[PDB]
Amino acid sequence: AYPMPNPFPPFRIAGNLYYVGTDDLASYLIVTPRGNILINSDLEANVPMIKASIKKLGFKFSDTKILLISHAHFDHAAGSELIKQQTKAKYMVMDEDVSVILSGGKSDFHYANDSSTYFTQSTVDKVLHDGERVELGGTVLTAHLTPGHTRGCTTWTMKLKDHGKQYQAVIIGSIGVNPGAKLVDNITYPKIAEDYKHSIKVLESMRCDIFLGSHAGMFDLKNKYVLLSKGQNNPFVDPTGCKNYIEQKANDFYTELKKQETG
Protein backbone atom coordinates (compact mmCIF):
# COMPACT_ATOMS: atom_id res chain seq x y z
CA ALA A 1 0.00 0.00 0.00
CA TYR A 2 1.32 3.44 -0.93
CA PRO A 3 1.98 5.51 2.22
CA MET A 4 -0.63 8.24 2.58
CA PRO A 5 1.16 11.61 2.27
CA ASN A 6 0.91 14.16 5.09
CA PRO A 7 -0.36 17.72 4.51
CA PHE A 8 2.24 20.35 3.70
CA PRO A 9 1.91 24.13 3.94
CA PRO A 10 1.35 25.67 0.48
CA PHE A 11 3.64 28.48 -0.64
CA ARG A 12 5.06 30.52 -3.50
CA ILE A 13 8.18 28.97 -5.02
CA ALA A 14 9.09 31.79 -7.41
CA GLY A 15 7.31 34.15 -9.79
CA ASN A 16 3.77 32.86 -10.28
CA LEU A 17 4.60 29.23 -9.40
CA TYR A 18 3.18 27.88 -6.12
CA TYR A 19 3.55 24.57 -4.29
CA VAL A 20 0.18 23.00 -3.43
CA GLY A 21 1.30 19.42 -2.85
CA THR A 22 1.90 17.17 0.14
CA ASP A 23 5.00 16.22 2.11
CA ASP A 24 5.64 13.57 -0.58
CA LEU A 25 3.59 13.71 -3.79
CA ALA A 26 4.33 17.12 -5.29
CA SER A 27 1.76 19.31 -7.03
CA TYR A 28 2.09 22.78 -8.52
CA LEU A 29 -0.14 25.75 -9.24
CA ILE A 30 0.70 28.31 -11.91
CA VAL A 31 -1.47 31.41 -11.43
CA THR A 32 -2.22 33.72 -14.37
CA PRO A 33 -4.68 36.56 -15.15
CA ARG A 34 -6.62 34.12 -17.33
CA GLY A 35 -6.80 31.23 -14.88
CA ASN A 36 -4.52 28.68 -13.26
CA ILE A 37 -2.67 25.53 -14.27
CA LEU A 38 -2.46 22.59 -11.87
CA ILE A 39 0.24 19.92 -12.18
CA ASN A 40 -0.33 16.45 -10.65
CA SER A 41 -3.66 15.35 -9.17
CA ASP A 42 -1.99 12.80 -6.89
CA LEU A 43 -4.09 10.28 -4.96
CA GLU A 44 -7.88 10.55 -4.71
CA ALA A 45 -7.43 11.20 -0.99
CA ASN A 46 -5.19 14.14 -1.94
CA VAL A 47 -7.69 16.07 -4.08
CA PRO A 48 -9.35 17.68 -1.03
CA MET A 49 -5.85 18.57 0.21
CA ILE A 50 -4.92 20.16 -3.12
CA LYS A 51 -8.16 22.18 -3.22
CA ALA A 52 -7.56 23.29 0.38
CA SER A 53 -3.98 24.37 -0.34
CA ILE A 54 -5.00 26.41 -3.39
CA LYS A 55 -7.68 28.18 -1.33
CA LYS A 56 -5.28 28.73 1.59
CA LEU A 57 -3.10 30.76 -0.78
CA GLY A 58 -6.08 32.94 -1.66
CA PHE A 59 -6.92 31.43 -5.04
CA LYS A 60 -10.03 29.71 -6.41
CA PHE A 61 -10.15 25.99 -7.16
CA SER A 62 -12.76 26.91 -9.77
CA ASP A 63 -10.09 28.90 -11.57
CA THR A 64 -8.25 25.70 -12.54
CA LYS A 65 -8.30 25.85 -16.35
CA ILE A 66 -5.68 23.23 -17.20
CA LEU A 67 -4.59 19.98 -15.54
CA LEU A 68 -1.18 18.45 -16.24
CA ILE A 69 0.83 15.52 -14.84
CA SER A 70 4.50 14.52 -14.52
CA HIS A 71 3.79 10.95 -15.67
CA ALA A 72 1.04 8.32 -15.81
CA HIS A 73 1.22 6.45 -12.49
CA PHE A 74 -1.56 6.41 -9.86
CA ASP A 75 0.39 8.49 -7.32
CA HIS A 76 0.51 11.42 -9.75
CA ALA A 77 -2.64 11.03 -11.85
CA ALA A 78 -5.22 9.04 -9.85
CA GLY A 79 -7.12 12.15 -8.75
CA SER A 80 -7.48 13.65 -12.23
CA GLU A 81 -11.07 12.54 -12.97
CA LEU A 82 -12.21 14.10 -9.68
CA ILE A 83 -10.51 17.38 -10.48
CA LYS A 84 -12.03 17.39 -13.96
CA GLN A 85 -15.50 16.80 -12.49
CA GLN A 86 -14.99 19.44 -9.81
CA THR A 87 -13.39 22.17 -11.96
CA LYS A 88 -13.92 21.29 -15.63
CA ALA A 89 -10.18 21.72 -16.11
CA LYS A 90 -8.83 20.72 -19.52
CA TYR A 91 -6.70 17.56 -19.16
CA MET A 92 -3.50 17.51 -21.24
CA VAL A 93 -1.19 14.48 -21.42
CA MET A 94 1.89 13.41 -23.38
CA ASP A 95 0.83 11.15 -26.28
CA GLU A 96 2.90 8.15 -25.12
CA ASP A 97 1.11 8.09 -21.74
CA VAL A 98 -2.44 8.66 -23.06
CA SER A 99 -3.24 4.94 -23.26
CA VAL A 100 -2.47 4.44 -19.57
CA ILE A 101 -4.61 7.43 -18.58
CA LEU A 102 -7.60 6.27 -20.66
CA SER A 103 -7.36 2.70 -19.34
CA GLY A 104 -6.87 3.78 -15.75
CA GLY A 105 -3.55 1.95 -15.69
CA LYS A 106 -4.68 -1.32 -17.24
CA SER A 107 -2.38 -0.79 -20.23
CA ASP A 108 0.67 -0.01 -18.07
CA PHE A 109 3.66 -1.83 -19.57
CA HIS A 110 4.73 -2.87 -16.07
CA TYR A 111 1.66 -2.78 -13.80
CA ALA A 112 -1.06 -3.87 -16.24
CA ASN A 113 -1.74 -6.87 -13.98
CA ASP A 114 -1.58 -5.17 -10.57
CA SER A 115 -5.06 -3.85 -9.74
CA SER A 116 -3.69 -2.00 -6.73
CA THR A 117 -2.13 0.38 -9.26
CA TYR A 118 -5.33 1.07 -11.23
CA PHE A 119 -7.07 4.43 -11.08
CA THR A 120 -10.21 6.10 -12.38
CA GLN A 121 -10.41 6.31 -16.16
CA SER A 122 -10.49 9.77 -17.74
CA THR A 123 -10.44 11.39 -21.17
CA VAL A 124 -7.57 13.50 -22.49
CA ASP A 125 -8.72 16.88 -23.80
CA LYS A 126 -5.43 17.58 -25.57
CA VAL A 127 -2.71 15.13 -26.54
CA LEU A 128 0.75 16.64 -26.08
CA HIS A 129 4.00 15.97 -27.92
CA ASP A 130 7.71 16.46 -27.20
CA GLY A 131 8.54 20.16 -26.94
CA GLU A 132 4.93 21.31 -27.21
CA ARG A 133 3.99 24.34 -25.13
CA VAL A 134 1.08 24.95 -22.75
CA GLU A 135 0.25 28.65 -22.57
CA LEU A 136 -2.24 30.56 -20.44
CA GLY A 137 -2.39 34.25 -19.59
CA GLY A 138 1.12 34.84 -20.90
CA THR A 139 2.71 32.01 -18.95
CA VAL A 140 4.47 29.41 -21.10
CA LEU A 141 5.21 25.84 -19.97
CA THR A 142 7.14 23.41 -22.15
CA ALA A 143 6.57 19.67 -22.10
CA HIS A 144 9.79 17.69 -22.43
CA LEU A 145 9.45 14.01 -23.22
CA THR A 146 11.83 12.20 -20.85
CA PRO A 147 10.62 8.56 -21.20
CA GLY A 148 11.65 5.41 -19.39
CA HIS A 149 9.89 5.62 -16.04
CA THR A 150 6.70 5.70 -18.13
CA ARG A 151 6.40 5.81 -21.92
CA GLY A 152 5.37 9.47 -21.81
CA CYS A 153 6.99 10.77 -18.63
CA THR A 154 7.04 14.54 -18.89
CA THR A 155 9.56 16.98 -17.46
CA TRP A 156 7.90 20.39 -17.30
CA THR A 157 9.89 23.60 -17.66
CA MET A 158 9.16 27.32 -17.49
CA LYS A 159 10.95 30.63 -16.92
CA LEU A 160 10.21 32.44 -13.67
CA LYS A 161 11.16 35.98 -12.68
CA ASP A 162 12.13 36.35 -9.04
CA HIS A 163 13.61 39.38 -7.28
CA GLY A 164 14.27 40.94 -10.67
CA LYS A 165 16.19 37.91 -11.95
CA GLN A 166 15.29 35.20 -14.48
CA TYR A 167 15.34 31.48 -13.62
CA GLN A 168 14.48 28.29 -15.44
CA ALA A 169 12.23 26.05 -13.35
CA VAL A 170 12.37 22.31 -14.08
CA ILE A 171 9.84 19.83 -12.69
CA ILE A 172 11.62 16.52 -13.24
CA GLY A 173 9.03 13.90 -14.18
CA SER A 174 11.19 11.02 -12.91
CA ILE A 175 13.91 8.82 -14.39
CA GLY A 176 13.91 6.37 -11.52
CA VAL A 177 13.83 2.65 -12.21
CA ASN A 178 10.94 1.02 -10.33
CA PRO A 179 11.63 -2.32 -8.59
CA GLY A 180 11.02 -5.14 -11.05
CA ALA A 181 11.09 -3.07 -14.24
CA LYS A 182 12.81 -5.08 -16.96
CA LEU A 183 15.46 -3.12 -18.88
CA VAL A 184 16.74 -5.94 -21.08
CA ASP A 185 14.52 -7.55 -23.73
CA ASN A 186 11.36 -6.02 -22.28
CA ILE A 187 8.45 -7.79 -23.98
CA THR A 188 5.87 -4.99 -23.83
CA TYR A 189 8.17 -1.92 -23.85
CA PRO A 190 11.24 -2.89 -25.96
CA LYS A 191 12.68 0.65 -26.15
CA ILE A 192 12.58 1.15 -22.38
CA ALA A 193 16.38 1.24 -21.92
CA GLU A 194 16.82 3.34 -25.06
CA ASP A 195 14.25 5.78 -23.65
CA TYR A 196 15.97 6.12 -20.27
CA LYS A 197 19.27 6.88 -21.99
CA HIS A 198 17.61 9.54 -24.11
CA SER A 199 16.14 11.09 -20.96
CA ILE A 200 19.58 11.17 -19.36
CA LYS A 201 20.97 12.96 -22.41
CA VAL A 202 18.13 15.49 -22.36
CA LEU A 203 18.25 16.15 -18.62
CA GLU A 204 22.04 16.35 -18.31
CA SER A 205 22.19 19.17 -20.87
CA MET A 206 19.13 21.03 -19.59
CA ARG A 207 19.45 24.40 -17.89
CA CYS A 208 18.09 23.99 -14.37
CA ASP A 209 17.94 26.84 -11.84
CA ILE A 210 14.81 26.13 -9.81
CA PHE A 211 15.03 22.41 -9.04
CA LEU A 212 11.69 20.63 -8.59
CA GLY A 213 10.15 17.19 -9.14
CA SER A 214 7.14 14.91 -8.93
CA HIS A 215 8.23 13.88 -5.42
CA ALA A 216 9.23 16.18 -2.56
CA GLY A 217 12.15 13.93 -1.64
CA MET A 218 13.69 14.49 -5.06
CA PHE A 219 14.54 18.11 -4.41
CA ASP A 220 14.68 18.39 -0.60
CA LEU A 221 11.32 20.15 -0.17
CA LYS A 222 11.27 20.09 3.64
CA ASN A 223 14.69 21.63 4.27
CA LYS A 224 14.27 24.26 1.55
CA TYR A 225 10.86 25.26 2.91
CA VAL A 226 12.44 25.78 6.34
CA LEU A 227 15.10 27.99 4.77
CA LEU A 228 12.33 29.88 2.97
CA SER A 229 10.53 30.47 6.29
CA LYS A 230 13.81 31.79 7.69
CA GLY A 231 13.71 34.26 4.80
CA GLN A 232 16.70 33.03 2.79
CA ASN A 233 17.36 34.10 -0.82
CA ASN A 234 15.12 31.63 -2.62
CA PRO A 235 16.53 28.30 -1.43
CA PHE A 236 14.65 26.68 -4.32
CA VAL A 237 17.13 28.17 -6.77
CA ASP A 238 19.43 25.14 -6.59
CA PRO A 239 21.31 24.52 -9.89
CA THR A 240 23.97 22.47 -8.11
CA GLY A 241 21.45 20.17 -6.46
CA CYS A 242 19.67 19.74 -9.78
CA LYS A 243 22.88 18.79 -11.58
CA ASN A 244 23.87 16.34 -8.84
CA TYR A 245 20.43 14.74 -8.61
CA ILE A 246 20.22 14.18 -12.35
CA GLU A 247 23.71 12.66 -12.41
CA GLN A 248 22.87 10.48 -9.40
CA LYS A 249 19.72 9.08 -11.00
CA ALA A 250 21.48 8.71 -14.34
CA ASN A 251 24.06 6.59 -12.54
CA ASP A 252 21.32 4.72 -10.65
CA PHE A 253 19.90 3.72 -14.02
CA TYR A 254 23.25 2.36 -15.20
CA THR A 255 23.71 0.52 -11.91
CA GLU A 256 20.39 -1.27 -12.48
CA LEU A 257 21.21 -1.88 -16.15
CA LYS A 258 24.56 -3.37 -15.08
CA LYS A 259 22.77 -5.56 -12.56
CA GLN A 260 20.27 -6.81 -15.13
CA GLU A 261 22.92 -7.34 -17.82
CA THR A 262 25.65 -8.98 -15.73
CA GLY A 263 24.26 -9.90 -12.31
Ligand SMILES: [Cl-]
Ligand atom coordinates in the same frame (compact mmCIF):
# COMPACT_ATOMS: atom_id res chain seq x y z
CL1 LIG B 1 14.81 9.54 -5.94
Ligand SMILES: [Zn+2]
Ligand atom coordinates in the same frame (compact mmCIF):
# COMPACT_ATOMS: atom_id res chain seq x y z
ZN1 LIG C 1 6.10 6.61 -11.18
Ligand SMILES: [Zn+2]
Ligand atom coordinates in the same frame (compact mmCIF):
# COMPACT_ATOMS: atom_id res chain seq x y z
ZN1 LIG D 1 5.83 8.67 -8.20
